[PDB]
RNA sequence: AAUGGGUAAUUAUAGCGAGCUAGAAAGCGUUUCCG
RNA sequence: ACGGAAACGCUUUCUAGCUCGCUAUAAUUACCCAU
């Protein structure tokens, strides 16, 4: 049969993440690395390409034997979910990562917040002669919350190996809380937290009970 | 898995300042009680335009008196019977050592998140780790600082390898030392110290008009440090011996040639969170002394010795934890060395 | 007044209008005006440039009203910055900020001043 | 009136090589988020059907429900999709059929 | 000035006219100019080449006025870009930008500069 | 007048072929969507017409 | 000495700038009127 | 009493698949100035 499973989750931040864009017409002496933002609302967002990239390259150090020279070489428990372009049976893989926008923009008000993206000055310092080279980079602020909206896609080939899939996705997020969700994360910046995970079926009458107790173990 | 973590418990001694770039200028704070209030000066101007004192305030700012305490912002509010604050609420309690009481000028802000709480950024702590690591290893503290073009003061940034470098597998030692930020601690631990330059070949300590708002000593701040590879993973439980060796080579010169009452003992692993400290904790010190003693033919000349010692005045405070109540300075009149801190590090 | 087709040439002609060191024959035609004092003035407006592509204009009348105070305070002390505030008509141009576009045009006028000051000297 | 400059945002992306960790950037035009497109989906009713009309309305409504759960166009596993369909209503632009029951059927 | 039949040849001759490293012959005839300095300037000429095809020339000109600001500032600090705006004259090609076709001709001139800077590497 | 370079657009297009799911592109040329064409249609009246002209 | 003040730098630096698949595929090339 | 008359260049076809805006980087240095 055919089904669609919706992994809804919240993304809290512990440190503020910096998923970069580039603004070419940024000012002199202003934000030199701005974040990706929504053009209408001007809130920062977490693009799904960055989630699908970090989760794939962190699961590739776990679920691949004979480490991948290219993302065309993932060991087909990983290529099922993420897709190999150079493979006839797994291109257009199972997962659909939606962009997490923001949820708590009202909740950041009444905590006292001028702007939803803070600016951090960051100072290259030369370790000969102590001369400096400052930065100003945007950073989506600390207690933000984003609507993670993964969607898994069940066909007849899926049916006997869904749980082997869901033991990966649940272990993707746990791998990603132990790492940084994009940015300049070697110095803080994007230690992240996936909270209140919830897989609900949205098309096709699939039992989501024996896999929803596995997401909170 | 291979991600092995560390807790760095950072005992702040000897007040610590970080960041924020900007500064509250003079005439932007009131000293009403025994505490400094720092308004949101746009809202200050809003309420003071509502009371129709805009031209009076613009004539107050450009007008200087022979006394200082009637130029600050409390003298505007008392020469106009202004009684309420209700402004952007932020105030820090004075120590009694900023000094004529409250005639300080141009305090430097401490770095703060969007919620308005101070915190130490892990970017700023992975520079103090990185000077220790770049000073204790003999391979990085070699004849570094390729000049090769124009001005001398550049560094061979490519000596510690960090780029991706196609073909070659990606090592990048300091990608694999992830230092996270602090929890945002309280504004009550901020004390507003001022700079003091203790010279060599001159016994005086001169007060400078710097007013870094700084973390009070004996505050404990927790950092997490995740290491991923084995090579960078081994340099972090060895930060104890490398911090002690960095201090041993740093007490060898520039913490010689000074009286020992200025410097204080540490008793945990010594680190220098950065402000004030200056040019020897920020720098790898030999090529530093050459090319950095070169860089000043100005009025504010870095003089003939290695440097001028950077101290502050801050309230005296004892730990009482070891076998003895440790007085925490070896002098009277409360001179601390700016930016000194201690830490203990622990896996997981 | 400065429109979008003149605020850069006005800034160039204002930095050329600026007072120079008649003394100090070693490196003559240097200004009595350092990079630090002018980049203080640029740092006044950098945050209003950044938080105006995001915010509505009516949430910014507070700090734009305080710029009136802050530029005349910076022109109070160090009387050769006062010369730049008079020459490059900044207090005249602050009164004309009435929308987002005029605000950002003034912020880019300040960046034009800093650009032609680094270029000239 | 929402104050946006363009109607296409530009999405700056990159790829990290698995070995050697080199980044290769990308710039992708995409439409901006709260943009809206007039969708019209002309359906022909010939004399032959007589049951297939209400049978096919179910299929069209289900195929519009599956575009909201899947993506559209895009690079959909990486964002780029998530179309919503609002104000679903049908009306006979060439007459003599009753779309009362179908506009009730489109909730 | 840029005609539509010479500007790529002007850009090639100007990239060859950039003076090179006579210092150490670890791959000599490199430039003082680095790729990132020149590529930050193409980064903002090539996002007006995109918008010019969509928007109108009377709707872009705050950006087009800021191009002169950023080229003057980047050729302030780090004189190897001042070398490029002298050899490949930009500030004179920027004053003559009154038409949208002239705007796009300047944007593709800047792209020809970066193409031959990469080619002669 | 309203700026249009060519009177035809070229629409790129493909044929994702159910699994293998390999695409198969296509370029088809269209006219553009404010083109207006001068349409004529001559109807004729005769002796047989005159009862059936209105119909 | 006291008093009043801060001042000078650096404002990002070095890179990557897209890569590989697909590049059209099935059908219909005349039928009827006519001898 | 037009080598004519009748005859849609039409049907089917997702510009799609894979791809972290990443890498390194203490907002720091210097210590004075004027009467």
* DSSP string over C47-105: HHHHTTSSS-GGGSHHHHHHHHHHHHHHHHSSHHHHHHHHHTTHHHHHTT--SHHHHHH
Q: How far apart are CA B244 and CA B132, in angstroms?
A: 9
* End-to-end Cα separation, chain F, in angstroms: 42
The tokens describing C102, both together, are 């005029």
Q: How far apart are CA F45 and CA A209, in angstroms?
A: 77
* Chain D residues within 8 A of E50 when measuring between CB atoms: 10
Could you tell me the CA-to-CA distances from E102 to B300, C28, C66, E1 in Å, in that order? 51, 39, 41, 10
Domain that holds residue B265: 1-39+89-348
| Nearest in space to C42 (alpha carbons), one of C19, C65, C11 | C11
Q: How far apart are CA E50 and CA E53, in angstroms?
A: 6
DSSP C5: T
Q: How far apart are CA A35 and CA A44, in angstroms?
A: 7
Half-sphere exposure of C70 (CA within 13 A, CB side): 22
C42, with CB counted inside 10 A (0-12, 13-18, 19+), is buried
E110, with CB counted inside 10 A (0-12, 13-18, 19+), is buried
**CA→C1' distance for F43 and H5 (Å):** 18
- The answer to whether residues B72 and B123 belong to one domain is no
Query: Residue A49 CB closer than 7 angstroms to strand H?
Result: yes
Q: How far apart are CA D9 and CA D3, in angstroms?
A: 13
Q: Neighbouring chains of D at 3+ CB pairs within 8 Å?
A: A, B, E
* Chain A residues within 8 A of B184 when measuring between CB atoms: 142
CB of D8 less than 8 A from some CB of E: yes
C-alpha B93 chain-centroid distance: 19
Q: How far apart are CA C20 and CA C32, in angstroms?
A: 6
> Which residues contact residue E53 at a Cβ distance below 8 angstroms, ignoring those fewer than 6 apart?
E104
Alpha carbon of A8: minimum distance to chain B alpha carbons (Å): 27
| Nearest in space to A56 (alpha carbons), one of A40, A44, A72 | A72
**CA→C1' distance for D96 and H16 (Å):** 41
Half-sphere exposure of B106 (CA within 13 A, CB side): 7
Half-sphere exposure of A36 (CA within 13 A, CB side): 24
Return the H-helix or E-strand segment holding B47: helix B41-50
Task: Specify whether the CB–CB gap between E46 and E110 falls below 8 A.
Answer: yes
Q: How far apart are CA C20 and CA A200, in angstroms?
A: 72
Half-sphere exposure of C29 (CA within 13 A, CB side): 6
> Which residues contact residue B315 at a Cβ distance below 8 angstroms, ignoring those fewer than 6 apart?
B95, B96, B97, B191, B216, B334
Q: How far apart are CA F13 and CA F23, in angstroms?
A: 10
The tokens describing C104, both together, are 């950002």
| Nearest in space to B102 (alpha carbons), one of B135, B65, B69, B75 | B69
CA-based radius of gyration for chain A = 20
Q: How far apart are CA C84 and CA C76, in angstroms?
A: 12
Yes or no, beta carbons of E69 and C105 under 8 Å apart = no
Q: Is E22 left (phi over 0), alpha (psi -120 to 50) or beta?
A: alpha
Task: Specify whether the CB–CB gap between B252 and B286 falls below 8 A.
Answer: no
Show which positions of strand G are touched by protein (CB under 7 A). 3-25
Q: How far apart are CA A57 and CA E31, in angstroms?
A: 37
Task: Specify whether the CB–CB gap between A170 and A17 falls below 8 A.
Answer: no
CB of B62 less than 8 A from some CB of C: yes
The number of distinct structural domains making up chain B is 2
Task: Specify whether the CB–CB gap between A139 and A82 falls below 8 A.
Answer: no
A170: β partners: none
> Which residues contact residue B312 at a Cβ distance below 8 angstroms, ignoring those fewer than 6 apart?
B14, B15, B193, B194, B195, B196, B212, B214, B276, B335, B336, B337, B338
Yes or no, beta carbons of A49 and D78 under 8 Å apart = yes
| Nearest in space to A121 (alpha carbons), one of A133, A136, A132 | A136
DSSP D17: -
C16-38 b/e (C-beta count within 10 Å ≥ 16 → b): eebeeeeeeeeeeeebbbeeebb
CB of E23 less than 8 A from some CB of B: yes
Task: Specify whether the CB–CB gap between A74 and A85 falls below 8 A.
Answer: no
C-alpha A42 chain-centroid distance: 19
Q: How far apart are CA E1 and CA D101, in angstroms?
A: 69
Q: How many CB atoms lie within 10 A of CB C111?
A: 26
The tokens describing B320, both together, are 């009482």
Alpha helices in chain E (DSSP H): 7-16, 35-45, 48-54, 61-74, 80-87, 91-95, 100-119
Could you tell me the CA-to-CA distances from A22 to A163, C51, C75, D11, D27 in Å, in that order? 40, 17, 35, 9, 10
Query: Residue F26 CB closer than 7 angstroms to strand H?
Result: yes
**A104 three-state secondary structure:** coil
The tokens describing D51, both together, are 């049951």
Instruction: Write the residue in A22, A25, A28 that is nearest to E73 by C-beta.
Output: A28
Number of residues assigned to chain F: 55
Query: Residue A182 CB closer than 7 angstroms to strand H?
Result: yes
- The answer to whether residues B6 and B105 belong to one domain is yes
Query: Residue B109 CB closer than 7 angstroms to strand H?
Result: no
Could you tell me the CA-to-CA distances from E107 to B101, C5, C112, D93, E1 in Å, in that order? 60, 19, 21, 49, 13
Dmax of chain C from CA atoms? Answer: 51
Q: How far apart are CA B127 and CA B121, in angstroms?
A: 11
Q: How far apart are CA E13 and CA B49, in angstroms?
A: 61
In degrees and rounded to multiples of 5, residue B309 shows phi and psi of: -75, 135
Could you tell me the CA-to-CA distances from E78 to A28, B86, D72, E29 in Å, in that order? 15, 48, 47, 19
**D92 three-state secondary structure:** coil
A68-105 b/e (C-beta count within 10 Å ≥ 16 → b): beebebbeeebbbbbbbeebeebbebbbbbbbbbbebe
Q: How many CB atoms lie within 10 A of CB C4?
A: 19
Q: Which residue matches tokens 């101007």?
A: B45
A11: β partners: A146, A194
Inter-helix orientation angle E7-16/E100-119, to 10°: 40
Q: How far apart are CA B226 and CA B209, in angstroms?
A: 40
**D22 three-state secondary structure:** coil
Question: Pairing state of beta strands B211-212 and B107-108?
Answer: parallel
Measured over the CA atoms of residue C48, residue C52, residue C54 and residue C55, the dihedral's sign is positive
State yes or no: cis peptide before F20, omega within 30 of 0: yes
The tokens describing C61, both together, are 């009348």
In degrees and rounded to multiples of 5, residue A39 shows phi and psi of: -70, -25
B11, with CB counted inside 10 A (0-12, 13-18, 19+), is buried
- The answer to whether residues B179 and B258 belong to one domain is yes
Measured over the CA atoms of residue C78, residue C84, residue C89 and residue C90, the dihedral's sign is negative
Query: Residue A184 CB closer than 7 angstroms to strand H?
Result: yes
Yes or no, beta carbons of B45 and C43 under 8 Å apart = no
> Which residues contact residue A89 at a Cβ distance below 8 angstroms, ignoring those fewer than 6 apart?
F19, F20
Q: How far apart are CA A100 and CA A38, in angstroms?
A: 11
Task: Specify whether the CB–CB gap between A137 and A122 falls below 8 A.
Answer: yes
| Nearest in space to A73 (alpha carbons), one of D13, B229, D79, D19 | D19
> Which residues contact residue F5 at a Cβ distance below 8 angstroms, ignoring those fewer than 6 apart?
none
Q: How far apart are CA A30 and CA C46, in angstroms?
A: 6
* Chain B residues within 8 A of C66 when measuring between CB atoms: 41-42, 45
Query: Residue D79 CB closer than 7 angstroms to strand H?
Result: no
Question: Pairing state of beta strands D8-16 and B309-313?
Answer: unpaired
Could you tell me the CA-to-CA distances from C54 to A215, B50, C50, C68 in Å, in that order? 37, 27, 7, 22
Task: Specify whether the CB–CB gap between A102 and A117 falls below 8 A.
Answer: no
Q: How far apart are CA A126 and CA B310, in angstroms?
A: 20
Could you tell me the CA-to-CA distances from B244 to B233, B234, B248 in Å, in that order? 19, 16, 6
Q: How far apart are CA A54 and CA A191, in angstroms?
A: 13
Q: How far apart are CA A136 and CA A143, in angstroms?
A: 21
Could you tell me the CA-to-CA distances from B238 to B55, B243, D96 in Å, in that order? 62, 8, 86
- The answer to whether residues B53 and B125 belong to one domain is no
The tokens describing A195, both together, are 């909270």
**B36 three-state secondary structure:** strand
Q: How many CB atoms lie within 10 A of CB B23?
A: 17
Inter-helix orientation angle A48-59/A162-177, to 10°: 100
- The answer to whether residues B75 and B163 belong to one domain is no
- Nearest nt by C1' to B71 Cα: G4
Half-sphere exposure of E54 (CA within 13 A, CB side): 11
Q: How far apart are CA B111 and CA A35, in angstroms?
A: 20
Chains D and B, touching by 3 or more CB pairs within 8 angstroms = yes
Q: How far apart are CA C7 and CA A139, in angstroms?
A: 32
DSSP B189: G
Q: Is B13 left (phi over 0), alpha (psi -120 to 50) or beta?
A: beta
* End-to-end Cα separation, chain A, in angstroms: 28
B301, with CB counted inside 10 A (0-12, 13-18, 19+), is exposed
Number of residues assigned to chain C: 121
Task: Specify whether the CB–CB gap between B184 and B118 falls below 8 A.
Answer: yes
Task: Specify whether the CB–CB gap between D85 and D39 falls below 8 A.
Answer: yes
């Amino acid at each position: 049969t055919f089904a669609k499973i919706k992994f809804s989750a919240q993304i809290r931040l512990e440190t503020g993440l910096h998923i970069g864009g580039s603004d070419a017409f940024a000012a002199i002496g202003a934000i030199n690395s701005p974040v990706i933002k929504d053009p209408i609302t001007n809130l920062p967002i977490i693009p799904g390409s960055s989630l699908k990239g970090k989760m794939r390259t962190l699961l590739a150090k776990v679920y691949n034997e004979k480490v991948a020279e290219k993302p065309s070489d993932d060991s087909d428990i990983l290529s099922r979910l993420f897709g190999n372009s150079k493979d006839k049976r797994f291109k257009m893989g199972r997962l659909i990562f939606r962009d997490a926008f923001l949820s708590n923009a009202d909740e950041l008000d009444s905590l006292g917040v001028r702007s939803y993206t803070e600016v951090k000055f960051e100072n290259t310092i030369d370790r000969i002669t102590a001369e400096a080279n400052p930065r100003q980079i945007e950073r989506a602020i600390r207690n933000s919350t984003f609507d993670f909206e993964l969607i898994y896609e069940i066909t007849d080939e899926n049916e006997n190996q869904v749980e082997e899939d869901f033991k990966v996705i649940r272990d993707g997020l746990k791998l990603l809380e132990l790492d940084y969700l994009g940015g300049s994360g070697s110095r803080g910046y994007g230690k992240v937290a996936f909270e209140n995970l919830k897989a609900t079926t949205v098309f096709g009458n699939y039992d989501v009970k024996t896999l929803n107790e596995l997401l909170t173990a | 898995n291979d991600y092995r973590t560390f807790k760095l418990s950072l005992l702040t001694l000897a007040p610590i300042h970080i960041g924020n770039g900007e500064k509250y200028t003079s005439r932007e704070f009131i000293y009403e009680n025994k505490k400094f209030y720092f308004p949101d000066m746009g809202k200050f101007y809003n309420k003071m335009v509502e009371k129709r004192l805009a031209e009076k305030f613009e004539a107050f700012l450009i007008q200087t008196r022979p006394n200082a305490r009637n130029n600050r912002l409390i003298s505007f509010l008392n020469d106009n019977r202004i009684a309420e604050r209700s402004f952007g609420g932020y105030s820090i309690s004075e120590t009694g050592l900023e000094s004529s009481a409250g005639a300080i000028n141009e305090v430097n802000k401490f770095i703060r998140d969007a919620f308005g709480n101070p915190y130490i950024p892990g970017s700023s702590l992975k520079g103090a780790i990185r000077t220790i690591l770049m000073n204790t290893t003999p391979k990085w503290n070699n004849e570094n600082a390729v000049n090769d073009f124009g001005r001398f003061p550049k560094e061979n940034k490519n000596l510690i390898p960090w780029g991706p470098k196609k073909g070659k597998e990606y090592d990048d030692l300091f990608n694999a030392i992830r230092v996270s930020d602090s929890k945002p601690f309280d504004n009550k631990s901020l004390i507003l110290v001022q700079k003091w330059d203790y010279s060599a070949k001159t016994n005086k300590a001169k007060p400078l008009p710097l007013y870094r708002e700084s973390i009070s000593p004996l505050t404990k701040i927790e950092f997490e440090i995740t290491t991923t590879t084995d090579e960078a993973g081994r340099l972090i439980e060895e930060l104890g011996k490398r911090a002690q060796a960095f201090y041993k080579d740093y007490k060898a010169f520039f913490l010689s040639e000074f009286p020992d009452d200025k410097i204080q003992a540490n008793l945990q692993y010594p680190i220098y969170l950065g402000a004030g400290s200056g040019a020897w904790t920020k720098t790898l010190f030999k090529q530093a002394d050459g090319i950095l003693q070169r860089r000043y033919s100005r009025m504010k000349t870095k003089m003939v010795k290695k440097g001028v010692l950077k101290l502050t005045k801050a309230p005296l405070k004892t730990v009482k934890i070891p076998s003895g109540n440790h007085s925490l300075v070896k002098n009277h009149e409360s001179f601390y060395e700016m930016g000194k801190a201690n830490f203990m590090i622990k896996e997981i | 007044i400065l429109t979008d087709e003149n605020y850069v040439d006005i800034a160039e002609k204002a930095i050329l209008k600026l007072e120079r060191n008649t003394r100090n024959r070693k490196n003559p035609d240097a200004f009595f005006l350092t990079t630090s004092k002018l980049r203080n003035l640029l740092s006044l407006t950098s945050t209003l440039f950044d938080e105006s592509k995001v915010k509505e204009y009516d949430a910014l009348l507070d700090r734009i009203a305080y710029l009136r105070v802050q530029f005349v305070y910076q022109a109070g002390r160090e009387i050769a910055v006062k010369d730049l505030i008079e020459k490059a008509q900044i207090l005249e141009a602050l009164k004309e900020i009435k929308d987002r576009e005029t605000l950002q045009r003034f912020c880019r006028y300040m960046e034009a001043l800093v650009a032609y000051f680094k270029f000239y000297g």
